[PDB]
Design a protein around this motif. Structure first.
Motif: not given
Length: 32
Positions: A7-9, A15-18, A22-23
């Protein structure tokens, strides 16, 4: 049900890709 920070990964994978997306948005915004 967590075998090895699954779940963490997933949370990172998303969220990282998000955050990157977002960047990208923040980069393009001041361009449009």
């Amino acid at each position: 049900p967590t075998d090895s920070g699954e779940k963490m990964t997933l949370s990172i994978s998303v969220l990282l890709s998000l955050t990157v997306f977002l960047l990208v948005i923040v980069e393009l915004i001041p361009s449009t």
